[PDB]
Design a protein around this nucleic acid. Structure first.
Length: 801
RNA sequence: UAAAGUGCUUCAGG
């Protein structure tokens, strides 16, 4: 259950000078002293815990703390550069403007042991000491800013609408590497709720110009969904409350049981209560109240008395417009991002931070220099008369003068237009149809003739009936092209009845994309169609593939998507040929927010069986790309899931023991690489080139991991995918695994570009995403798992493309 | 829903 050591360093590829947003730390060899704090009352927000500790140090200089400057993680851990005049536990009081605070020695954090571990002598890096360093480095900014996870934010207006806005801050964390510790610094931007009166909040969320008329059920529900769980503060007295719900009734009629001077209790309206007790005549008695605290204490607050508390990060899903504006506002070219980080470093001034200097730490001002390697891309073999070989350039190629490897001929297909005939006319349909055939012929997926059926529809209630009709009627029906008028629930039903009921291949298309056609678009559309019908768009040039393909091998991609309770969705896909091109999908509904794939064993078993049925081979090796995992989970994830994979093999055959390689894929980190030489910048965004690989300098000191930017940066700064090998029975060299991983990024069939993660990992995402739409209704557990199960025929092919 | 990439993505009280 221990990750294997780095076997070697890669040598393949053209060298490339890079800078990473990792800054060398000079750490002393001294011993750090760790103390534990028990603060009563407990479960106070880390913020107030810090204020308490702050006043504690200021107040107890005379006796306890002296000249030194302690650091504090906000909870129970206090660290010092030199030992305190403590040898035992000590109890003390703190009055904020009363808290019981005790302090007891825990143990000495050894930085020398860390030095040694970084040189590679010790089997494990003392996580405790790294944590200690992290506490030192972020103690100051923790007092100066609003900490959110490992990031820090402050107030600049960058509105997104709907009561939300995007704040700019920075990420900070201490990381180990070979020889030395590193400080990772990056810009970050995330959504927050604007600090404002709740009355203004309802306006922005319900699209009112001015509050002004009670609320309709529709409005109340939308308002409830938005404010539920948010903190508010009262303006009629300052205390904060968390919103449990929004009353159905208006403040004028909403009541609560108040006990009179005599033991008798009477129902009193919120409005009347605020009139008598607070002398306040509610200006908006017709609006609902916020229910806070306990359901049992009946605490309701008028809207006009509440403000949305400042500093609350938005977690609920953003709208498409909000997401669009945020992406626009946050996109930075690589050169621009590098400069922003240099500014952050300058204003961070770590080398003048009294707490950093207190612990004798020093941080280098310049980014770490690292030599990357630009791996050669694989050739892409197409099929047809030409059998053309496409050579990716800058992570991109095209299909001009090329035809699908194994292109499917379409003799029977139907068009179902759910867009109003007014906008999408017969003229548009036959113009679109004509051009699609034309393009389909160029691509080698010949649409042999006109559609056998074409009708308009609406309501999303006409889907299954029409589909029942098409299947029973037209023999050998291959494809049903569906046309939608923008976002709509019909898409969900189309995929539900298509994938989950009748088992028919469907390809949706926006109304706007049939009105005005483009060769590229229609061409990209053919990529999905040919695949959905069982075709092979292309394959890696058979020769030039890594030696792993010398024996039957299966590639698995796994991911878990969590909703914004509703269950999480686990998806595992497996390759079904030697190219590898075709994948089968397994999917499961599981516990809300559970990271581990509960039913992995059974999912892997299903895939192994499908693989054997397809290839008549039993995999000698299983290559398992796992996306959506964190460092805090590598141990637990590897344990259950590695075992589950083994269990699948055993449950299949007593002595079937293929070599397993377990690789975690991570896009969600703050490692950024920049070209040192301007001439190596690609595109307007000036990013590193596709294929850029780094397995030195900023990587794990002992274990087997590497960064690989497999994709071309289009806009903003590229995120190099990180790959961590948690287990390897197959004893890959660094080069082979890195090349293999890069080539798998070229097998993704939705586009003729190298994508940012291996195809199987990507497909897993698509499968889980598709499951969402399948679960859309109109919760019996057995029914959820059932609304996610796919039709027999469809399971053989990549319906999720 | 042509596509990829880019930002995020847990203690008078009523």
């Amino acid at each position: 259950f221990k990750p294997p050591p780095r076997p070697d360093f890669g040598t393949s590829g053209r060298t490339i000078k890079l800078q990473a947003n990792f800054f060398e730390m000079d750490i002393p060899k001294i011993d750090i002293y760790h103390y534990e704090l028990d603060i009563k009352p407990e479960k106070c927000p880390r913020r107030v815990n810090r204020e308490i500790v702050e006043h504690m140090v200021q107040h107890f200089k005379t006796q306890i703390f002296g000249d030194r400057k302690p650091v504090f993680d906000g909870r129970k851990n206090l660290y010092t550069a030199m030992p305190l005049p403590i040898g035992r536990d000590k109890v003390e009081l703190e009055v904020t403007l009363i808290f019981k605070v005790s302090i007891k020695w825990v143990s000495c954090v050894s930085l020398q042991a860390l030095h040694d571990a970084l040189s590679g002598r010790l089997p494990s890096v003392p996580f405790e000491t790294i944590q200690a360093l992290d506490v030192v480095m972020r103690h100051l900014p923790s007092m100066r800013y609003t900490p959110v996870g490992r990031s820090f934010f402050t107030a600049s207006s960058n509105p997104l609408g709907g009561g939300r806005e995007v704040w700019f801050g920075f990420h900070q964390s201490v990381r180990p590497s070979l020889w030395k510790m590193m400080l990772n610094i990056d810009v970050s931007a995330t959504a927050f709720y604007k600090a404002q009166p709740v009355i203004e909040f309802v306006c922005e969320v319900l699209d009112f110009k001015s509050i002004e008329k009670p609320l309709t059920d529709s409005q109340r529900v939308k308002f409830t969904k938005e404010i539920k769980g948010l903190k508010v503060e009262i303006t009629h007295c300052k205390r904060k409350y968390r919103v449990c719900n929004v009353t159905r009734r208006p403040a004028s009629h909403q009541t609560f049981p108040l006990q009179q001077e005599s033991g008798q209790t009477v129902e009193c309206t919120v409005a009347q209560y605020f009139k008598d007790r607070h002398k306040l005549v509610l200006r908006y008695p017709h609006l609902p109240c916020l229910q806070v605290g306990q359901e049992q204490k009946h605490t309701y607050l008028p809207l006009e008395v509440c403000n949305i508390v400042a500093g609350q990060r938005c977690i609920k899903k953003l709208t498409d417009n909000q997401t669009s504006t945020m992406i626009r506002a946050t996109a930075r070219s690589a050169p621009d991002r590098q400069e922003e980080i240099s500014k952050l470093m300058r204003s961070a001034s770590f080398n003048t931070d009294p707490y950093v200097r207190e612990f004798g730490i020093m941080v280098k001002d310049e980014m770490t220099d690292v030599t990357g390697r630009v791996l050669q891309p694989p050739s892409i073999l197409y099929g047809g008369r030409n059998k053309a070989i496409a050579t990716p350039v800058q992570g991109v190629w095209d299909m001009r003068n090329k035809q699908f490897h194994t292109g499917i001929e379409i003799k029977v297909w139907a068009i179902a237009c759910f867009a109003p005939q007014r906008q999408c006319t017969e003229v548009h349909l036959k113009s679109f149809t004509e051009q699609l055939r034309k393009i389909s012929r160029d691509a080698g997926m010949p649409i042999q003739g006109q559609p056998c059926f074409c009708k308009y529809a609406q309501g999303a209630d006409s889907v299954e009936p029409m589909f029942r009709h098409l299947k029973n009627t037209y023999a050998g029906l291959q494809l049903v092209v569906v046309i939608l008028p923008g976002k709509t629930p019909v898409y969900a039903e189309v995929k539900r009845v298509g994938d989950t009921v009748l088992g028919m291949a469907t390809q949706c298309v926006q109304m706007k994309n049939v009105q005005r056609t483009t060769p590229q678009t229609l061409s990209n559309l053919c990529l999905k169609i040919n695949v959905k019908l069982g075709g092979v768009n292309n394959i890696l040039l058979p020769q030039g593939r890594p030696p792993v393909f010398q024996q039957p091998v299966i590639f698995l991609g796994a991911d878990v998507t969590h909703p914004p309770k509703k269950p999480s969705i686990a998806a595992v896909v497996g390759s079904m040929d030697a190219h590898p091109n075709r994948y089968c999908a397994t999917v499961r509904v599981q516990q809300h927010r559970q990271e581990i794939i509960q039913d992995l064993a059974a999912m892997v078993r299903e895939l192994l069986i499908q693989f054997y049925k397809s290839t008549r081979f039993k995999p000698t090796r299983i290559i398992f790309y796992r996306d959506g995992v964190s460092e805090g989970q590598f141990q637990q994830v590897l344990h259950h899931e590695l075992l589950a994979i083994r269990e699948a093999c055993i449950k299949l055959e007593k002595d079937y023991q293929p070599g397993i390689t377990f690789i975690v894929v991570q896009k969600r980190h703050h490692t950024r690489l920049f070209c040192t030489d301007k001439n190596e910048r690609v595109g307007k965004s000036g990013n590193i080139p596709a294929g850029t690989t780094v397995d030195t300098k900023i990587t794990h000191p002992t274990e087997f991991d590497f960064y690989l930017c497999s994709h071309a940066g289009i806009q903003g700064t590229s995120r190099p995918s990180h790959y961590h090998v948690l287990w390897d029975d197959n004893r890959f060299s660094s080069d082979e695994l890195q090349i293999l991983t890069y080539q798998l990024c070229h097998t993704y069939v939705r586009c003729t570009r190298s994508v940012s993660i291996p195809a199987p990992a990507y497909y897993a995402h698509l499968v889980a995403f598709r499951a969402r739409y399948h679960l859309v209704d109109k919760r019996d557990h057995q029914a959820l798992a059932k609304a996610v199960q796919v039709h027999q025929d469809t399971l053989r092919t990549m319906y999720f493309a």
